[PDB]
């Protein structure tokens, strides 16, 4: 039990408390992905829309910068035959130092994806842990 292991287990416990309870065989994820994860999101589809935020970084205002970069997208199975996809996320520590690249910019495929994700609301409980 690490600082994030048992709270991941109570995370999927309250996921099983929110919906149909018959869950079985939680995925044995490694410690390397769990101990650097900011947000555990649950959803229905494998394609996860990732979030976004703006800034005031030396002009370039009202653009869209994604923050939660996926590093592990595994699934868990319930009884019977209903698939839910786990997603672990990491906050993007982008600074005010680049050659206007590798700071994550919009590339508006994710913008339209977030529009559909917010309009349909397929997101399930998304909570912070460390």
């Amino acid at each position: 039990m690490t600082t994030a292991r048992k709270k991941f287990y109570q995370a999927i416990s309250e996921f099983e408390a929110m919906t149909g309870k018959d869950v079985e065989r939680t995925p044995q994820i490694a410690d390397e992905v769990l101990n650097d994860a900011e947000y555990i999101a649950f959803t229905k589809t494998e394609k996860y829309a990732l979030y976004l935020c703006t800034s005031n970084v030396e002009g370039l205002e009202d653009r869209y910068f994604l923050d939660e970069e996926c590093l592990d997208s595994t699934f868990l199975e319930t009884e019977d035959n209903e698939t839910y996809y786990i997603h672990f996320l990491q906050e993007t520590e982008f600074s005010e130092d680049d050659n206007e690249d590798e700071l994550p910019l919009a590339t508006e495929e994710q913008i339209e994806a977030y529009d559909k994700q917010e309009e349909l609301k397929a997101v399930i409980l998304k909570k912070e842990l460390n």
Binding site: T26, E32, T54, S55, D62, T74, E93, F94, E96, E118
Partner: protein
């Protein structure tokens, strides 16, 4: 002037409050230090401190054990390399120098490329001759021919780095190898544990059926088809399902409420096993042990399967066959894909990224993700047999190194190493006389007790040595000392008791601790036979008779067995019912029966002279674990023993400890009797008290003798003071910070010591919605209401059982569909006019429970007194109340409360129990922080030895401050600002001082200190209303908070006027001035400027994110070792910054390298922090900066306050992070309206109060269009986020006609736009908008910086504009 201090304690926060006598909090001009222009500040003297939660210390223990396991493994490799160090230079010189260089790029590698066999050709012949190492050692175990030396070495260096588990002990034998004897063992322990309606499996034999080649989720149905048992969800069947990886449940099986999931594959097996075991009792516990044992056995039969040529290679020769069923059954599948699907072949084997077979080896996948991906494809195919039957049994396309070969007993590896050295001993000289040493360094499991093998430089080790040289497992015995290290072992990780220190607590199942628990339960059990006409408890000789006549017979005994084997047998008592013990005893004499089975003697365990002998045999069993040291300490007691119990008594283990030591139970004696705790708790007499009531007693000597030794000897350091507390480390961090801020807070108010300091803490609202908690036991009562009553109320209206959180229908359905006042029925939809009354009025207690509240139609049905209701109402329903107590619809306490017509009403002991029931505050952290904060500021002496108690410590609950908050319209909801810490502490002062100034005499039960025994049985008048502030009694109305009530109100309508300006009842001093109290209190809770500070920290922790990631051309990677340049080898990214530094310097800008003046932040990671502070200017020249001004290097930790124009406060969390600092001056009427409107059905007070709040919100609907523009100009001043603000203004405009309750709840969720900390994204009505993080750290460089003190009172302001 006198003053008083109030303290809220928490995890995140701590609140400090300073009041005078007149309750106007002071306000003082403080001095500013630095080089700014504001030479004086004028601040209030009231505030809070919030900070990061105090993390525990389990992650550091985990990382430390990982580091030491890796260092032990590398040095086992070092020993085995050193034993071949001579003759491997004979074969090929730089061979070990190349196995050390197996990681770097071939260009800077200083040898040839191929590690083994040197050249190119023999390496390829090695791979296509030996495909893997399991094939290699499965070859050369059965090889008469001589093998190559480096070949045997690389077979053996793999052999000792993967050793298995040492959870099994001894050597393997068919009593512990195969599943036959283990399944016989579990059916024996099941048959022995129940000894009734059993099951026997002598006919069916699961030695091959449970070991078969099938699917486990079908194999348990096979076994329940063979052995009948109970069912497919029976307890025997569910435990077999636990033995095969499945996760059954037991709520339908134990006849228990909550479900019970169990599996062995999770890391948290034991923490859930004891969690369920405390719910069900310990009498099953060892049986589950065998279950886990049985499970491991079948997993053994999963890996080793070939039993035909099973000699000399049971492991390696097995799963190479699995390699064969991987190989051809790969090709088959390829020969089944291209024939039928030419598409989805490029995305299966050339994919690399989509959970296919390409990602199953060359990428990131698992067995189960790949099985789920090829389920729909391969299940779709037309002709594919022997694959779906192989997929459900988890054995296709399956690698060697699973996550489920963590069930390898090391003896298998040791046996094939034994063979691998026997079949080479005939050839090589050095290897013939070192096989003992090689097998020894394989099997050397460094034991628990011998600790870290240190040489005094440790912080954690304790083992001592009989010599001084380099420690090897060659010679582990004659170097380290056994008995001295064991003696230092037992005293180090013993646990002292908080109830009595300097003592070693007893084990969890000692004989003495078991007698303690059974005599703590049996001293509160009461029996009723026909003839006593009033219930009575047991006597001492009855307790001796029942522990000699029923407990020695069976482990668990029910009340039926009690009344049919004791009252009927020798007492000749027949018509007896027992109220105390419910149905069974949760306390059990398990090890009594256990050691009775082990020694097979009845005299010896029952003889009272062998007590320390038995308890320290149990102590040395529960303390040690390995098989060697466990036996010679029993050789001390080898005189009594019979040499057949040696292989029997050393088998049982224990885990966990009790609660209290031996010197506290059978230790100290009474000054007037000479008896111990146990001596009274089996021989007391008629006053059948309890143990905790004996702790709760004041008059007896034992509690005072406890608090004699609860203080230490000489006063320790304050870190050593907090070192032996309890709780989380978070509240320990809070306690240390609140002692620091008190000890600094005395300094600021003229250095005069205070008068009254108040403390409390409260937290942990994690009930998880209580949706199934009612229907598990409480609502489930009506399911045994059918057992007694018969009225199936849900049969006429099935109403759901998860929305019972509304209290009125909840208390209706907990009332049989009836009334407890008059014989009638009720309307379910007309419950709004029906009234909720209380069994005891609001002038005697305060509680909102089912024990208090009842529901009815008319208040006249209760009665016309403030006492218990009338005699006819209890006696006309004395029949039915015995049923709804018998159906367990209500508890015993409220039924005994209504039947006070027998006891006259409010008895003197009863009203004493109510008047002190609120003020007994029995949480240990409160008493210990009281002791710590007493012993610091209250230490002056006089002409005698006793202490001048200068400053009064005082300790109040959260109930009184919550009531003073609620009843007088002083509301709070947590999500507005973080002022609700500090303001909370303020009320903790007021209800503090205005209770001690008004009650001087009755402070002798909730001040920490030696005071009198002056009780309350003669402090409350047993008659009518006595003289106002001139009488002998303290009060009559048992609710303490009627003192604060301007005008009390009870159900009789007697609107009795307690006087306006109240004066204390013995000395004549005004304590509570009505015309100048609530004006002052409502002014101070509406004050705008409170000093909250976020304290600074240096970020200790990990170097970088714990996930090394593959190579890339970006230079911001952190290397693995020194010379592994991460543009080739990759590694760590995103380092954690500990603290930034503000540096003024010059850079070599331009093509002419001209030194231009710069002033910037620079992040410093923890990687070079010590490298920073050993020499800062040389490291900064190495970074690439010149002209370092050493005085001007400004250290700037995380959470540092920057203030700039229009009062904008931003606080700096990293080099490129900022967090909002300012907060809201939101006045009292707005917060009162927001709490009252946002809980339109969530107050549960009076119907008149309901119409008052309804008309209040309907007249003050004018507020939600002024809150919005306050937030508008506020966020336009201090946030400057225009876009999302305009979005939420338009979104507010779009819901203008929305109803009130939903709009108030959405506006308190809207408040989190403007808290402190990092900004977040908030759930609005619909328009969930994006967070706006700040990274533009340029504006910080020209602002002002505040190095503030710990309480925020003291401060200094440094400027960065002219900083040059």
């Amino acid at each position: 002037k006198k003053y008083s201090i109030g303290l809220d304690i928490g995890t995140n926060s701590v609140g400090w409050a300073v009041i005078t006598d007149d309750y106007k909090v002071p306000s003082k001009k403080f001095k500013v230090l630095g080089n700014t222009d504001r030479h004086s500040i004028k601040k209030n003297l009231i505030g809070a401190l919030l900070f990061d939660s105090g993390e525990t210390a389990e992650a550091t223990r985990l990382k430390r054990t990982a580091r030491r396991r890796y260092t032990r493994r590398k040095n086992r490799i070092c020993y085995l390399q050193e034993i071949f160090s001579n003759e491997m230079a004979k074969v090929d010189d730089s061979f070990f120098h190349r196995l050390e260089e197996s990681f770097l790029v071939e260009e800077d590698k200083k040898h040839e490329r191929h590690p083994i066999f040197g050249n190119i050709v023999d390496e390829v012949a090695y791979h296509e001759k030996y495909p893997t190492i399991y094939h290699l050692r499965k070859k050369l175990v059965d090889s008469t021919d001589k093998a190559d030396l480096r070949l045997i070495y690389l077979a053996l260096a793999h052999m000792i780095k993967f050793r298995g588990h040492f959870l099994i002990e001894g050597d393997l034998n068919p009593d512990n190898s195969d599943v036959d004897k283990l399944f016989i063992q579990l059916v024996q322990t099941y048959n022995q544990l129940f000894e009734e309606n059993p099951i026997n499996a002598s006919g069916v034999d699961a030695k091959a059926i449970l070991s078969a080649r099938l699917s486990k989720s079908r194999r348990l149905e096979n076994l329940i088809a063979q052995l009948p048992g109970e069912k497919k969800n029976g307890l025997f069947g569910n435990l077999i399902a636990l033995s095969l990886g499945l996760t059954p449940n037991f709520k339908s099986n134990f006849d228990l409420a909550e479900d019970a999931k169990l599996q062995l594959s999770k890391d948290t097996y034991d923490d859930d096993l004891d969690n369920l075991l405390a719910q069900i009792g310990d009498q099953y516990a060892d049986l589950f042990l065998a279950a886990k044992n049985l499970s491991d056995a079948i997993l053994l039969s999963d890996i080793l399967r070939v039993n035909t040529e099973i000699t000399k290679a049971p492991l390696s020769a097995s799963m190479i066959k699995r390699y064969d069923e991987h190989h051809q059954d790969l090709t088959l599948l390829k020969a089944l894909v291209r024939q039928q699907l030419p598409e989805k072949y490029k995305e299966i084997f050339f994919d690399q990224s989509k959970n296919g077979y390409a990602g199953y080896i060359d990428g990131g996948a698992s067995q189960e993700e790949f099985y789920k991906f090829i389920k729909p494809i391969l299940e779709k195919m037309d002709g594919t047999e022997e694959l779906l039957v192989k997929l459900n049994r988890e054995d296709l396309l399956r690698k060697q190194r699973t996550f489920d070969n963590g069930s390898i007993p090391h003896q298998i590896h040791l046996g094939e190493l034994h063979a691998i050295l026997r079949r080479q001993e005939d050839f090589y000289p050095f290897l013939k006389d070192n096989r003992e040493k090689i097998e020894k360094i394989l099997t050397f499991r460094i034991p628990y007790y011998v600790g870290p093998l240190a040489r005094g430089n440790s912080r954690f080790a304790w083992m001592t040595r009989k010599s001084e040289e380099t420690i090897t497992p060659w010679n582990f015995e004659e170097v380290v000392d056994k008995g001295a290290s064991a003696q230092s072992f037992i005293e180090r990780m013993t646990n002292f008791d908080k109830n009595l220190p300097n003592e070693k607590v007893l084990p969890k199942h000692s004989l003495l601790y078991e007698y303690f628990t059974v005599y703590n339960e049996l001293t509160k059990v009461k029996y009723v036979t026909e003839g006593m006409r009033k219930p009575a408890f047991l006597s001492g000789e009855q307790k001796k008779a029942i522990v000699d006549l029923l407990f020695k017979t069976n482990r668990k005994v029910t009340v039926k067995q009690l009344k049919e084997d004791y009252f009927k047998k020798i007492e000749c008592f027949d018509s007896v019912e027992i109220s105390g013990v419910e149905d069974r005893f949760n306390a059990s004499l398990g090890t009594y029966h256990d050691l009775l089975k082990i020694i097979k003697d009845k005299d010896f365990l029952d003889n009272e002279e062998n007590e320390d002998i038995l308890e320290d045999i149990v102590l040395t069993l529960t303390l040690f674990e390995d098989r060697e040291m466990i036996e010679e300490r029993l050789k001390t007691y080898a005189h009594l023993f019979d040499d057949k119990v040696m292989k029997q008594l050393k088998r049982r283990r224990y885990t966990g400890w009790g609660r209290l030591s031996r010197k506290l139970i059978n230790g100290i004696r009474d000054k007037q009797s000479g008896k111990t705790i146990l001596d009274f708790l089996k021989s007391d007499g008629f006053a059948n008290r309890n143990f905790m009531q004996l702790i709760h007693d004041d008059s007896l000597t034992f509690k005072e003798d406890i608090q004699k030794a609860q203080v230490s000897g000489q006063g320790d350091s304050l870190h050593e003071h907090i070192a032996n507390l309890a709780g989380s480390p978070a509240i320990k961090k809070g306690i240390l910070q609140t002692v620091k801020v008190v000890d600094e807070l005395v300094k600021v108010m003229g250095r005069h010591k205070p008068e009254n300091i108040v403390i409390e803490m409260a937290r942990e609202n994690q009930t998880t919605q209580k949706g199934q908690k009612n229907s598990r036991e409480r609502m489930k009562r009506i399911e045994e209401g059918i057992k007694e009553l018969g009225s199936q109320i849900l049969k006429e209206h099935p109403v759901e059982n998860t929305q019972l959180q509304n209290e009125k229908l909840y208390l209706y359905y907990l009332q049989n569909g009836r009334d407890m006042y008059v014989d009638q029925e009720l309307d379910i939809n007309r419950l709004s006019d029906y009234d909720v009354d209380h069994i005891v009025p609001q002038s005697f207690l305060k509680d909102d429970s089912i024990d208090n509240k009842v529901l009815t139609r008319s208040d006249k049905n209760r009665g016309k007194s403030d006492n218990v209701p009338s005699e006819e109402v209890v006696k006309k329903m004395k029949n039915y109340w015995r049923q709804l107590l018998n159906a367990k619809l209500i508890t015993q306490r409220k039924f005994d409360n209504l039947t006070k017509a027998e006891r006259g009403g409010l008895s003197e002991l009863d009203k004493a129990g109510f008047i002190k029931r609120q003020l007994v505050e029995t949480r240990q952290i409160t008493k210990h922080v009281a002791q710590i904060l007493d012993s610091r500021m209250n230490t002056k002496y006089d002409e005698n030895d006793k202490l001048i108690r200068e400053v009064k410590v005082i300790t109040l609950k959260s109930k009184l401050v919550s009531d003073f908050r609620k009843d007088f319209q002083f509301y709070k909801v947590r999500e507005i600002n973080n002022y609700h810490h500090a303001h909370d502490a303020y009320l903790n002062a007021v209800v503090g001082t205005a209770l001690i100034k008004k009650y001087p005499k009755l402070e002798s039960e909730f001040v920490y200190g030696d005071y009198k025994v002056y009780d309350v049985r003669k402090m409350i008048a047993k008659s009518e209303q006595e003289i106002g502030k001139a009488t002998a009694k303290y009060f009559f109305y048992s609710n303490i908070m009627n003192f604060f009530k301007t005008e009390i109100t009870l159900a009789n309508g007697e609107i009795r006027k307690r006087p306006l300006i109240e004066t204390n009842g013995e000395t004549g001093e005004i304590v509570w001035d009505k015309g100048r109290d609530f004006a002052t209190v409502r002014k101070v809770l509406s004050m705008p400027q409170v000093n909250i500070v976020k304290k600074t920290e240096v970020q200790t922790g990990g170097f970088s994110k714990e996930s090394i990631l593959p190579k890339r051309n970006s230079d911001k990677l952190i290397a693995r070792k020194k010379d592994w340049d991460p543009k080739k080898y990759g590694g760590f990214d995103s380092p954690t910054v500990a603290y930034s530094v503000l540096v003024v310097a010059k850079v070599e800008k331009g093509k002419s390298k001209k030194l231009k003046s710069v002033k910037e932040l620079l992040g410093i990671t923890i990687m070079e922090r010590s490298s920073f502070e050993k020499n800062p200017i040389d490291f900064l020249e190495a970074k690439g900066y010149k002209e370092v001004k050493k005085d001007l290097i400004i250290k700037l930790p995380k959470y540092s306050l920057f203030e700039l124009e229009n009062g904008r406060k931003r606080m700096l969390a990293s080099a490129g992070e900022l967090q909002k600092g300012n907060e809201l001056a939101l006045p009292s009427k707005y917060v009162n309206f927001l709490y009252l409107a946002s809980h339109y059905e969530k107050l549960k007070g009076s119907p008149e109060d309901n119409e008052q709040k309804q008309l209040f919100v309907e007249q003050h609907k004018h507020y939600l269009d002024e809150i919005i523009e306050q937030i508008s100009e506020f966020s336009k001043r201090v946030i400057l986020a225009d876009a999302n603000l305009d979005k939420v203004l338009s979104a507010y405009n779009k819901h203008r006609d929305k109803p009130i309750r939903e709009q108030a709840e959405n506006i308190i969720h809207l408040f989190t736009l403007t808290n402190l900390g990092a900004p977040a994204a908030f759930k609005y009505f619909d328009t969930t908008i994006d967070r706006k993080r700040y990274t533009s750290t340029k504006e910080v460089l020209d602002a002002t910086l505040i190095h503030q003190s710990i309480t925020g009172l003291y401060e200094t302001r440094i400027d960065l504009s002219q900083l040059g």
